[PDB]
Design a protein around this ligand. Structure first.
Ligand SMILES: COCC[C@H]1CNC(=O)c2c1[nH]c(-c1ccncc1F)c2Nc1cccc(Cl)c1OC
Ligand SMILES: [Cl-]
Length: 309
């Protein structure tokens, strides 16, 4: 239509290599390498636990291009349920720096605490992920990699969406991103994304549906044992992930609506906030979980208390 673009006045913060003490590697995979460490901003009397991400690519130019694309997207994002970029470090391979999420990724968390996770926790996570995704939709950001492995656990009551490696900014009243044939996790992708490389907020809703399924199955692998090359044909025949045992029809119906062929028929993130919030008020009416009732979960400053103008 006629709507233009406003200036992006986000501040990119450059942090000195020498203000960081890497304690340990947290993990390595397709995301690159993530380290744990401690940030001590020279001027203040403050110590801030951080995570540090480097990419692992064929050459340094490619790695630096892709990591600065991810810094660009994240610099502009400020929500309690989305990872906040604290800054970058201009080592040879550029690094991103964020607040340390000490419990790690929600996929491993639910697998590790499977016998201790009640309905209140599971519905509250679904609410928080939908809030984060609704925020990204309002910023015209399509994440394109929403999965339980890309949700981090600050505390059992507080999760954040991470990994902006595939994220794209839509122009004002632009509806779609058309991709150019890089690797994309097929078992979390909308059917139009597999067939036509079209990505929308409504394709992120499909991924949200698979993420909820991963949580409600305590971290099962979707389409377990099925090769990626068969998923397209399975979806086109009308097959979907099965109803998790703990799920009432109310919860499974939400997941199924996320996996409808008509992208505009799928729920909006703003509707998923309302639905999961309603269910979180009476959690044992919506999820039927064995032993639900009887299971619990220096100058060091939390980065959410260290605010940068
Ligand atoms: C070892 O983690 C495996 C999942 C991996 C998958 N993909 C990620 O992107 C990521 C992962 N862990 C963490 C992470 C964060 C905060 N605390 C702990 C952690 F592990 C991630 N974010 C991250 C890390 C460092 C800097 C920035 Cl700007 C980050 O946000 C994009
Ligand atoms: Cl994967």
């Amino acid at each position: 239509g006629s709507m233009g673009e406003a200036p992006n006045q986000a501040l990119l913060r450059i942090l000195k290599e020498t203000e960081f003490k890497k304690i340990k590697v947290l993990g390595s995979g397709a995301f690159g390498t993530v380290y744990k460490g401690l940030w001590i901003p020279e001027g203040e009397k403050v110590k801030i636990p951080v995570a540090i991400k480097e990419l692992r690519e064929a050459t340094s130019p490619k790695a630096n291009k892709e990591i600065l694309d991810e810094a660009y997207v994240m610099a502009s994002v400020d929500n309690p349920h989305v990872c906040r970029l604290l800054g970058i470090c201009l080592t040879s391979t550029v690094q991103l720096i964020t607040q340390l999420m000490p419990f790690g990724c929600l996929l491993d968390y639910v697998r590790e605490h499977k016998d201790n996770i009640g309905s209140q926790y599971l519905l509250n996570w679904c609410v928080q992920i939908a809030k984060g995704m609704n925020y990204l939709e309002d910023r015209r950001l399509v994440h394109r990699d929403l999965a339980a492995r890309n949700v981090l656990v600050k505390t059992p009551q507080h999760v954040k969406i991470t990994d902006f490696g595939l994220a794209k900014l839509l122009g004002a009243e632009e509806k779609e991103y058309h991709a150019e044939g890089g690797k994309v996790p097929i078992k979390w992708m909308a059917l139009e994304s597999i067939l036509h490389r079209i990505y929308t907020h409504q394709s992120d809703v499909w991924s949200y549906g698979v993420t909820v399924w991963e949580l409600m199955t305590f971290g099962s692998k979707p389409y377990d044992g099925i090769p990626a090359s068969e998923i397209s044909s399975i979806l086109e025949k009308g097959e979907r992930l099965p109803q998790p045992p703990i799920c009432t029809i109310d919860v499974y119906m939400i997941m199924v609506k996320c996996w409808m062929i008509d992208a505009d028929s799928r729920p909006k993130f703003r509707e998923l906030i309302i639905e999961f919030s309603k269910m979180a008020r009476d959690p044992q009416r919506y999820l039927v979980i064995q032993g639900d009732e009887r299971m619990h979960l220096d100058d060091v400053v939390d980065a959410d208390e260290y605010l940068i103008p």
